[PDB]
Amino acid sequence: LIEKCPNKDCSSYGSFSDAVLELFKLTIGLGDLNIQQNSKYPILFLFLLITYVILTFVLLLNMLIALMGETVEN
Amino acid sequence: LIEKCPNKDCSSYGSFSDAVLELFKLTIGLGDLNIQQNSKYPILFLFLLITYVILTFVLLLNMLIALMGETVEN
Amino acid sequence: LVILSVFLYLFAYKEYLACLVLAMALGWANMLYYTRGFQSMSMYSVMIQKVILHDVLKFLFVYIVFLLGFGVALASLIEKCPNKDCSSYGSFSDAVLELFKLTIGLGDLNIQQNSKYPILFLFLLITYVILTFVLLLNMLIALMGETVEN
Ligand SMILES: COc1ncnc(OC)c1C(=O)Nc1nc(C(F)(F)F)c(-c2ccnc(C(C)(C)C#N)c2)s1
Ligand SMILES: COc1ncnc(OC)c1C(=O)Nc1nc(C(F)(F)F)c(-c2ccnc(C(C)(C)C#N)c2)s1
Ligand SMILES: COc1ncnc(OC)c1C(=O)Nc1nc(C(F)(F)F)c(-c2ccnc(C(C)(C)C#N)c2)s1
Ligand SMILES: COc1ncnc(OC)c1C(=O)Nc1nc(C(F)(F)F)c(-c2ccnc(C(C)(C)C#N)c2)s1
Ligand SMILES: COc1ncnc(OC)c1C(=O)Nc1nc(C(F)(F)F)c(-c2ccnc(C(C)(C)C#N)c2)s1
Ligand SMILES: COc1ncnc(OC)c1C(=O)Nc1nc(C(F)(F)F)c(-c2ccnc(C(C)(C)C#N)c2)s1
Ligand SMILES: COc1ncnc(OC)c1C(=O)Nc1nc(C(F)(F)F)c(-c2ccnc(C(C)(C)C#N)c2)s1
């Protein structure tokens, strides 16, 4: 979704590796959501970013309730 | 609750989308309760902000409890 | 609140915005009465009964005791200094404010507070943090009390 730009590129989601790194840092609480990523479709970019956030939170919550599985007597 | 000011980021809860973004990334742990106030009712501002935080924590924990309890067996 | 905001707005009061925004927020909160049986506003609908009874007032009493006692204990430890005083725990009110902001996740604990006993000051500050956390978590497991079937 990101457009080639003249060399910080106005976007930290540049090549595929930079987007993968930003997403990883996000699920590691090391990141930041900016609505300014040098994109022709900023609303679609924001939609997919928030979708990723929510889906990774769902995965994390699955693993959380799995490893907790309290039934504290049991 | 945020006063217009003559255009660098005097506030952080400025435009409506700005406020929605700052609240959203306050929920997901990328936000700070202590920002550039620039508001004329700062105690009411912080009361509403802490109320947002508390109510969305109660909502999040409600959903988390419903999940961790109801779906372990069904 | 709404009618008061209107009365203050047609008068030349700039204090109407507080009441108007509070009324807007309280109306969005009153929207619960219509959505109590929607499985998502469940916890609010049930904590109208649980937390309002006595546990929040017990918590408030114990928390005021913690706040006042530790405010005195920390304001006492601080030395009068020549006028930011190197210490945000100055008078009793400044220590009470710092402690309140702490339990509200608004503050910051520093080892440098201009005390003759900085280790005792740090000890009491961390003791306050841990005790308020214990209090909050008692109230938390009370408000949740899941037994999700029940
Ligand atoms: C937009 O953010 C996200 N979107 C989708 N999924 C996500 O996580 C699955 C996230 C996210 O924020 N993840 C995080 N990971 C970690 C880490 F533990 F690795 F450090 C986070 C962290 C970092 C610093 N202090 C804490 C405290 C002390 C508060 C705790 N506990 C937690 S936060
Ligand atoms: C308001 O509280 C909630 N309401 C509803 N759902 C929730 O979870 C989705 C929450 C909540 O706090 N969730 C969490 N967030 C994070 C963070 F990583 F982001 F910090 C959690 C975390 C932190 C450190 N290590 C883990 C491991 C990987 C060990 C696990 N498991 C998970 S846990
Ligand atoms: C980052 O970790 C944190 N650091 C400090 N405070 C925190 O709580 C406010 C948190 C934390 O967990 N935040 C969360 N935000 C959200 C979001 F919905 F908004 F996306 C969370 C979420 C997202 C999607 N599905 C769930 C389910 C339904 C599984 C549940 N339950 C929860 S979780
Ligand atoms: C469904 O809920 C909502 N949906 C969309 N928007 C909303 O507000 C914009 C809301 C909402 O609940 N708003 C509120 N207003 C107020 C008022 F104090 F002003 F009365 C609230 C209040 C009142 C008394 N004790 C508290 C606690 C104990 C939590 C503290 N601290 C909070 S809560
Ligand atoms: C109702 O409580 C209060 N109301 C108003 N003011 C207060 O203090 C100013 C207080 C209060 O609790 N004071 C405290 N004094 C001390 C001490 F230093 F003597 F040990 C406390 C302490 C310190 C370290 N470990 C513990 C234990 C062993 C319990 C653990 N874990 C307790 S706690
Ligand atoms: C040294 O700190 C303490 N010592 C003793 N007791 C304490 O609490 C009883 C504390 C403490 O940090 N309290 C806090 N209160 C609040 C508030 F909800 F009011 F905003 C906190 C807050 C602020 C901003 N974002 C969140 C997220 C989104 C992560 C959530 N959830 C939570 S944090
Ligand atoms: C602001 O609150 C948070 N925001 C985001 N992430 C968080 O997780 C790291 C936290 C958080 O709870 N921090 C805490 N640290 C401690 C400490 F034990 F070290 F003192 C906490 C504590 C203090 C007193 N009694 C307990 C009991 C025994 C009830 C337990 N368990 C836990 S609480």
XYZ file of C-alpha atoms and ligand atoms in Angstrom:
529
model
C 0.000 0.000 0.000
C 3.006 2.335 0.409
C 4.252 4.500 -2.455
C 7.908 4.875 -3.395
C 8.976 8.317 -2.206
C 11.988 10.645 -2.345
C 14.990 8.535 1.483
C 13.449 8.274 4.918
C 10.538 7.791 2.453
C 8.078 9.346 4.964
C 7.121 5.719 5.712
C 8.588 3.166 8.082
C 6.581 0.550 6.146
C 8.890 0.594 3.158
C 10.188 -2.708 1.853
C 8.621 -5.974 2.992
C 11.222 -6.438 5.723
C 10.507 -3.008 7.211
C 6.778 -3.735 7.372
C 7.441 -7.135 8.954
C 9.739 -5.460 11.484
C 7.184 -2.765 12.330
C 4.468 -5.381 12.788
C 6.700 -7.530 15.009
C 7.646 -4.531 17.148
C 3.928 -3.776 17.389
C 3.016 -7.200 18.821
C 6.045 -6.682 21.153
C 4.764 -3.281 22.351
C 7.736 -1.490 20.865
C 5.907 0.340 18.126
C 3.517 3.174 17.374
C 0.466 3.746 15.185
C 0.820 6.685 12.807
C -1.931 7.674 10.388
C 0.781 9.303 8.242
C 2.652 6.561 6.376
C 2.942 8.036 2.848
C 0.165 5.936 1.346
C -2.351 6.570 -1.407
C -4.976 4.724 0.677
C -4.381 5.829 4.285
C -7.781 4.612 5.494
C -7.205 1.120 4.088
C -3.712 1.109 5.592
C -5.145 2.109 8.970
C -7.873 -0.531 8.663
C -5.354 -3.301 8.005
C -3.048 -2.095 10.787
C -5.843 -2.111 13.369
C -7.043 -5.467 12.030
C -3.555 -6.853 12.626
C -3.482 -5.405 16.143
C -6.842 -6.948 17.036
C -6.022 -10.332 15.497
C -2.707 -10.600 17.326
C -4.528 -9.643 20.525
C -6.998 -12.480 19.897
C -4.123 -14.932 19.401
C -2.402 -13.699 22.559
C -5.650 -14.047 24.508
C -6.057 -17.617 23.282
C -2.567 -18.485 24.504
C -3.283 -16.601 27.742
C -6.459 -18.476 28.662
C -4.692 -21.659 27.541
C -1.663 -21.367 29.820
C -3.808 -20.013 32.665
C -6.682 -22.549 32.450
C -7.302 -21.744 36.070
C -9.909 -24.056 37.690
C -7.610 -23.276 40.584
C -8.576 -26.367 42.575
C -7.562 -28.529 39.603
C -12.472 20.349 26.023
C -9.358 21.367 24.063
C -8.887 24.997 23.063
C -7.954 25.961 19.526
C -4.515 27.567 19.419
C -2.421 29.446 16.826
C -0.419 25.152 14.299
C 2.408 23.019 15.684
C 1.065 20.375 18.077
C -0.050 22.588 20.939
C -2.409 19.786 22.010
C -2.566 16.052 21.447
C -6.352 15.663 21.676
C -6.916 18.203 18.937
C -9.046 17.193 15.979
C -11.625 14.485 16.596
C -9.619 11.807 14.786
C -6.605 12.817 16.869
C -8.561 12.205 20.071
C -9.914 8.868 18.837
C -6.417 7.739 17.860
C -4.912 8.765 21.196
C -7.663 6.960 23.104
C -7.296 3.830 20.975
C -3.556 3.662 21.492
C -4.123 4.441 25.146
C -6.140 1.218 25.267
C -3.544 -0.940 23.498
C -0.755 0.357 25.710
C 0.938 2.811 23.344
C -0.457 5.948 24.992
C 0.435 8.248 27.885
C -1.950 9.755 30.426
C 0.302 12.837 30.725
C 0.260 14.839 27.486
C 0.320 18.501 26.447
C -2.826 19.646 28.244
C -3.615 22.942 26.450
C -7.118 22.584 27.914
C -8.784 25.089 30.218
C -10.452 22.422 32.409
C -7.493 20.110 33.072
C -8.945 18.311 36.091
C -12.135 17.532 34.175
C -9.998 16.446 31.213
C -7.974 14.053 33.355
C -11.119 12.820 35.101
C -12.688 11.942 31.751
C -9.443 10.321 30.585
C -9.087 8.170 33.708
C -12.788 7.336 33.420
C -12.212 6.163 29.853
C -9.311 4.022 31.052
C -11.279 2.494 33.942
C -14.438 1.797 31.940
C -12.556 0.242 29.038
C -10.535 -1.863 31.464
C -13.781 -3.084 33.033
C -15.166 -3.805 29.559
C -11.998 -5.594 28.425
C -11.922 -7.683 31.604
C -15.636 -8.449 31.208
C -15.033 -9.861 27.729
C -11.936 -11.700 28.967
C -13.883 -13.270 31.838
C -16.744 -14.293 29.553
C -14.205 -15.978 27.268
C -12.123 -17.642 29.983
C -15.212 -19.023 31.698
C -17.931 -19.788 29.168
C -15.844 -21.291 26.354
C -13.541 -23.575 28.365
C -16.299 -26.206 28.253
C -18.842 -25.302 25.544
C -26.688 19.082 34.096
C -28.108 19.770 30.635
C -30.531 22.473 31.751
C -27.804 24.003 33.937
C -25.424 24.032 30.964
C -28.071 25.840 28.920
C -28.718 28.385 31.682
C -24.977 29.004 32.078
C -24.519 29.269 28.305
C -27.185 31.919 27.766
C -25.650 33.778 30.674
C -22.105 34.963 30.060
C -20.483 32.010 31.847
C -17.552 30.173 30.264
C -18.053 27.439 32.881
C -20.960 25.948 30.917
C -18.674 23.701 28.869
C -17.781 21.621 31.926
C -21.430 20.872 32.700
C -22.288 20.307 29.033
C -19.469 17.807 28.494
C -20.265 16.110 31.805
C -23.907 15.857 30.739
C -22.979 14.374 27.366
C -20.732 11.806 29.052
C -23.291 10.971 31.737
C -25.943 10.471 29.059
C -23.724 8.069 27.160
C -23.295 6.303 30.506
C -27.057 6.274 31.174
C -27.328 4.441 27.857
C -26.613 1.369 30.011
C -30.175 1.218 31.386
C -31.390 0.210 27.915
C -28.591 -2.301 27.196
C -28.330 -4.234 30.468
C -29.272 -7.592 28.954
C -26.835 -7.553 26.042
C -24.062 -9.818 27.415
C -21.495 -7.063 26.815
C -22.749 -4.534 29.383
C -23.151 -7.439 31.814
C -20.349 -6.407 34.161
C -21.666 -2.855 34.524
C -25.212 -4.110 35.113
C -24.023 -6.442 37.874
C -21.495 -4.050 39.441
C -24.332 -1.591 39.872
C -25.202 -4.107 42.598
C -21.833 -5.526 43.690
C -19.356 -2.667 43.966
C -21.746 0.092 45.061
C -22.762 -1.747 48.231
C -19.833 -1.586 50.671
C -16.552 -2.822 49.156
C -15.858 0.470 47.387
C -16.479 2.427 50.598
C -14.274 0.082 52.627
C -11.662 0.537 49.898
C -12.082 4.318 50.010
C -11.681 4.446 53.790
C -8.561 2.267 53.799
C -7.165 4.208 50.839
C -7.688 7.572 52.538
C -5.921 6.166 55.597
C -3.022 4.975 53.422
C -2.873 8.310 51.605
C -2.921 10.505 54.713
C -0.505 8.349 56.698
C 2.029 8.004 53.903
C 1.664 11.664 52.966
C 2.676 12.613 56.489
C 5.410 9.959 56.582
C 6.934 11.181 53.325
C 6.480 14.931 53.825
C 8.142 14.574 57.229
C 11.255 12.935 55.746
C 11.938 15.852 53.365
C 14.282 18.697 54.281
C 13.394 22.354 53.838
C 15.518 23.478 50.905
C 16.390 26.662 48.994
C 12.199 27.035 45.777
C 11.508 24.066 43.554
C 13.050 22.616 46.765
C 14.537 19.676 44.782
C 11.534 17.723 46.115
C 7.998 17.348 44.830
C 7.143 15.914 48.273
C 7.227 19.277 49.987
C 4.302 20.264 52.178
C 1.739 17.663 53.241
C -0.537 18.559 50.333
C 2.207 18.023 47.751
C 2.992 14.582 49.166
C -0.707 13.676 49.189
C -0.980 14.865 45.584
C 2.070 12.872 44.477
C 0.735 9.746 46.173
C -2.711 10.168 44.598
C -1.187 10.668 41.150
C 0.845 7.521 41.803
C -2.214 5.331 42.469
C -3.747 6.996 39.345
C -0.744 6.071 37.163
C 0.154 9.702 36.631
C 3.397 10.066 38.575
C 6.974 8.863 38.701
C 9.118 7.673 41.591
C 12.640 9.083 41.776
C 15.380 8.159 44.219
C 16.331 11.858 44.376
C 13.881 13.694 46.629
C 16.133 15.832 48.896
C 15.857 13.719 52.037
C 18.337 13.015 54.798
C 17.100 9.396 54.657
C 16.615 8.524 50.968
C 16.528 4.770 51.591
C 13.742 5.117 54.164
C 11.874 7.438 51.797
C 12.206 4.894 48.987
C 11.125 2.100 51.340
C 7.950 3.922 52.364
C 7.180 4.913 48.769
C 7.442 1.330 47.512
C 5.457 0.157 50.543
C 2.701 2.585 49.565
C 2.785 1.367 45.962
C 2.505 -2.281 47.004
C -0.225 -1.635 49.575
C -2.356 0.338 47.127
C -1.866 -2.479 44.618
C -3.069 -5.012 47.208
C -6.106 -2.817 47.901
C -6.899 -2.388 44.206
C -6.579 -6.115 43.585
C -8.869 -6.985 46.476
C -11.446 -4.665 44.926
C -10.669 -6.216 41.527
C -11.291 -9.835 42.513
C -14.373 -8.578 44.357
C -15.788 -6.819 41.285
C -14.989 -9.810 39.067
C -15.943 -12.742 41.361
C -16.336 -14.666 38.151
C -17.741 -18.195 38.686
C -18.855 -17.403 35.166
C -21.835 -19.751 35.314
C -23.097 -18.010 38.454
C -0.457 -2.495 19.360
O 0.055 -3.326 20.356
C -0.260 -4.671 20.172
N -1.092 -5.085 19.067
C -1.424 -6.525 18.877
N -0.903 -7.543 19.821
C -0.072 -7.124 20.924
O 0.428 -8.066 21.820
C 0.014 -9.368 21.542
C 0.250 -5.691 21.112
C 1.143 -5.312 22.274
O 1.147 -4.222 22.730
N 1.998 -6.361 22.769
C 2.936 -6.223 23.857
N 4.008 -7.120 24.054
C 4.800 -6.675 25.320
C 6.020 -7.393 25.884
F 5.630 -8.170 26.931
F 6.549 -8.201 24.927
F 6.951 -6.491 26.300
C 4.175 -5.487 25.829
C 4.624 -4.697 27.043
C 5.740 -3.723 26.924
C 6.192 -2.926 28.142
N 5.522 -3.121 29.445
C 4.418 -4.098 29.547
C 3.702 -4.311 30.862
C 4.664 -4.141 32.035
C 2.606 -3.261 30.912
C 3.121 -5.720 30.850
N 2.645 -6.743 30.786
C 3.951 -4.893 28.343
S 2.999 -5.150 24.952
C -7.390 -5.065 30.151
O -6.906 -6.359 30.326
C -7.322 -7.221 29.316
N -8.727 -7.348 29.011
C -9.193 -8.259 27.929
N -8.210 -9.053 27.154
C -6.804 -8.924 27.461
O -5.866 -9.667 26.742
C -6.100 -9.707 25.365
C -6.349 -8.022 28.547
C -4.852 -7.940 28.779
O -4.351 -7.248 29.598
N -4.095 -8.776 27.885
C -2.666 -8.889 27.804
N -1.895 -7.960 27.079
C -0.409 -8.408 27.161
C 0.753 -7.676 26.520
F 1.639 -8.582 26.022
F 0.281 -6.925 25.492
F 1.351 -6.877 27.447
C -0.338 -9.611 27.936
C 0.954 -10.362 28.210
C 2.145 -9.689 28.803
C 3.425 -10.484 29.031
N 3.478 -11.918 28.652
C 2.295 -12.582 28.048
C 2.332 -14.054 27.648
C 2.919 -14.169 26.242
C 3.183 -14.825 28.631
C 0.913 -14.606 27.661
N -0.141 -15.016 27.681
C 1.020 -11.792 27.817
S -1.739 -9.984 28.359
C -1.356 -4.003 25.036
O -1.580 -4.582 26.280
C -2.121 -3.704 27.210
N -1.259 -2.843 27.973
C -1.847 -1.911 28.969
N -3.318 -1.871 29.172
C -4.180 -2.732 28.408
O -5.566 -2.731 28.592
C -6.241 -1.560 28.258
C -3.573 -3.666 27.450
C -4.481 -4.538 26.637
O -4.572 -5.693 26.754
N -5.250 -3.809 25.698
C -6.161 -4.371 24.768
N -6.706 -3.562 23.775
C -7.629 -4.437 22.902
C -8.406 -3.915 21.716
F -9.600 -4.519 21.614
F -8.598 -2.592 21.870
F -7.707 -4.117 20.582
C -7.600 -5.767 23.420
C -8.384 -6.886 22.760
C -8.424 -6.882 21.276
C -9.180 -7.945 20.509
N -9.885 -8.998 21.258
C -9.857 -9.015 22.731
C -10.608 -10.122 23.451
C -12.060 -10.090 23.003
C -9.971 -11.463 23.107
C -10.549 -9.880 24.949
N -10.497 -9.690 26.059
C -9.100 -7.944 23.509
S -6.668 -5.793 24.605
C -21.341 3.297 28.026
O -20.489 4.191 28.676
C -20.077 5.250 27.869
N -20.117 5.098 26.432
C -19.682 6.211 25.547
N -19.208 7.483 26.148
C -19.174 7.636 27.583
O -18.726 8.841 28.123
C -18.325 9.764 27.156
C -19.601 6.522 28.467
C -19.557 6.711 29.979
O -19.724 5.803 30.714
N -19.307 8.042 30.488
C -19.237 8.396 31.893
N -19.505 9.699 32.365
C -19.330 9.723 33.913
C -19.545 10.966 34.764
F -18.701 10.964 35.830
F -19.320 12.068 33.998
F -20.829 11.000 35.214
C -18.947 8.398 34.342
C -18.653 7.956 35.778
C -19.563 8.317 36.904
C -19.236 7.873 38.330
N -18.008 7.079 38.598
C -17.094 6.717 37.485
C -15.834 5.891 37.756
C -15.998 5.126 39.071
C -15.624 4.889 36.631
C -14.607 6.798 37.822
N -13.698 7.470 37.873
C -17.425 7.163 36.067
S -18.871 7.525 33.107
C -3.350 1.089 57.654
O -2.054 1.144 57.138
C -1.500 2.420 57.182
N -2.349 3.579 57.325
C -1.761 4.942 57.373
N -0.289 5.110 57.276
C 0.558 3.954 57.136
O 1.939 4.112 57.047
C 2.357 5.442 57.070
C -0.037 2.599 57.085
C 0.887 1.405 56.938
O 0.527 0.391 56.459
N 2.233 1.583 57.401
C 3.262 0.577 57.345
N 4.360 0.586 58.226
C 5.280 -0.618 57.882
C 6.566 -0.934 58.630
F 7.577 -0.191 58.100
F 6.406 -0.592 59.939
F 6.861 -2.261 58.542
C 4.690 -1.326 56.779
C 5.279 -2.567 56.124
C 6.594 -2.431 55.445
C 7.242 -3.633 54.775
N 6.555 -4.945 54.811
C 5.250 -5.084 55.493
C 4.555 -6.446 55.503
C 5.368 -7.412 56.385
C 3.150 -6.309 56.035
C 4.546 -6.964 54.064
N 4.519 -7.314 52.985
C 4.593 -3.887 56.162
S 3.418 -0.613 56.387
C 3.007 3.140 40.974
O 1.768 2.934 40.370
C 0.802 2.446 41.247
N 1.143 2.146 42.618
C 0.106 1.627 43.551
N -1.284 1.409 43.079
C -1.620 1.710 41.708
O -2.921 1.513 41.252
C -3.802 1.115 42.257
C -0.584 2.222 40.783
C -0.992 2.539 39.358
O -0.206 2.566 38.478
N -2.391 2.826 39.163
C -2.995 3.165 37.898
N -4.261 3.785 37.798
C -4.592 3.988 36.287
C -5.875 4.607 35.749
F -6.707 3.612 35.346
F -6.489 5.305 36.742
F -5.597 5.431 34.700
C -3.479 3.494 35.525
C -3.357 3.512 34.014
C -2.931 4.746 33.308
C -2.802 4.770 31.794
N -3.107 3.553 31.010
C -3.537 2.331 31.727
C -3.858 1.067 30.971
C -4.413 1.382 29.602
C -2.524 0.317 30.864
C -4.860 0.268 31.796
N -5.555 -0.335 32.451
C -3.664 2.293 33.242
S -2.441 2.965 36.480
C -0.117 -0.199 37.091
O -0.441 -1.558 37.127
C 0.034 -2.282 36.029
N -0.163 -1.772 34.685
C 0.343 -2.541 33.510
N 1.050 -3.835 33.725
C 1.246 -4.344 35.071
O 1.911 -5.558 35.268
C 3.291 -5.424 35.453
C 0.741 -3.574 36.238
C 0.948 -4.110 37.653
O 0.077 -4.701 38.196
N 2.214 -3.893 38.327
C 2.429 -4.395 39.674
N 3.691 -4.607 40.290
C 3.445 -5.154 41.740
C 4.528 -5.518 42.753
F 4.275 -6.758 43.264
F 5.745 -5.520 42.136
F 4.532 -4.601 43.763
C 2.022 -5.252 41.946
C 1.332 -5.739 43.219
C 1.361 -4.896 44.450
C 0.671 -5.381 45.723
N -0.029 -6.692 45.733
C -0.061 -7.535 44.510
C -0.783 -8.880 44.531
C -0.273 -9.712 45.704
C -2.284 -8.650 44.684
C -0.511 -9.623 43.224
N -0.311 -10.175 42.255
C 0.627 -7.054 43.234
S 1.336 -4.789 40.682
